[PDB]
Symmetry: C2
Subunit: 229 residues, 2 copies
Amino acid sequence: SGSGSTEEEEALLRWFQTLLAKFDELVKQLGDPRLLEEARRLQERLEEAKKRGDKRTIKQLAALLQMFVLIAQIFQLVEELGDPKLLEQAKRLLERLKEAVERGDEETIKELLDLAHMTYLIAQIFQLVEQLGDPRLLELAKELLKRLKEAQERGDRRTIERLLRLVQMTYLIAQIFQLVRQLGDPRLLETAKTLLTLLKLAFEEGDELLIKSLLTLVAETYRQAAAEQ
Amino acid sequence: SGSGSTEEEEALLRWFQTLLAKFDELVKQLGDPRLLEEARRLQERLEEAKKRGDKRTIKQLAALLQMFVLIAQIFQLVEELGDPKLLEQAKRLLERLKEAVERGDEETIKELLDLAHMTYLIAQIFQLVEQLGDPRLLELAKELLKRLKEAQERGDRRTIERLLRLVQMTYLIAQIFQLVRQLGDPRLLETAKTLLTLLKLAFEEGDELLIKSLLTLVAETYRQAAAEQ
């Protein structure tokens, strides 16, 4: 009761409405039966919560809807790539999410959020690898896809968080190598090669202090290289 | 022995040499006695490890040096701001780091890395708040400074990781409000206000799924707003 719908409730609903429009447009483009059915469920669940003034559920739905948007974005990208292993992973994300939601397994939902961001990045990595024609980066992309499959089935929050950082670093380094190609900078190429060496080191000995530190180095290097074109 | 210095060892040393030059320049500008003394120690420790071909220690030193660079960057920014509470926190970061290094407490080192990034961001938030003359954002900056002090003394990895995300979101939202001022967009202002409502919600009910989801929303909103100026 109180003063009716609160500013926080209205903001959560505006977030959900914006996400839902994005999801709808993606689902219409994809024509995927399972995402079509989840659209109806999400639409129903919100209307129920918005009717019931249940702030907790609205919060959960906004978060869940943002994850379904990402999943739809994944399906779009992975269908473009055509990679069957990534397609299988995208399908697994959706199946596990539906299962986690049904069971109220919030821990798995959080893990799936990381796994979904990782899947999208890995798909982007493969896109960049293709552009660059770079077999060395391809090897890392393939290893990440292997680790993603293992994490989806057997990973815990910590192993998933570690892998997300490796994926993020690999995507940034692929972006640095792309800048090398566009700018023709021999000095940046040596930098990128040094970073690739350190990245391989991170793949081999996944110490958290090393990974966190190298992710900062790579991210700062990318920003600096992108700023100092 | 093997084949002598490995490409990975050489890459770690190049990382350390680049960091050390940055640290030296910062220390020379700051003239801070404690950072001056840590420069000598870091210089000594590396030479010893580089002499000894101890890859593990070189890896640790590269990471530790990157943290001392950040600490020096913090001292520079916080001395410019002049905020005595932030100065105290910067001094605490350094004291705790030296202690953690002496005791080999790698868990505390990792926590301090997050705490240092957070301290730098909070200092940047205060800078932006000043620019905008925005008392609403000031309230959040002050609350974050309070939470930072508590986390430094009593926080664990999870509470520190949660706070880092709140700080990151607050910095991005401050950046969005700055864009509103530069672009004079009434629609972006309503967006920013909605995000500020959701941010306050995150400060009040720090659910991890909510925070992670809102950080994505805020980060994507900033990128989109910065791209769709």
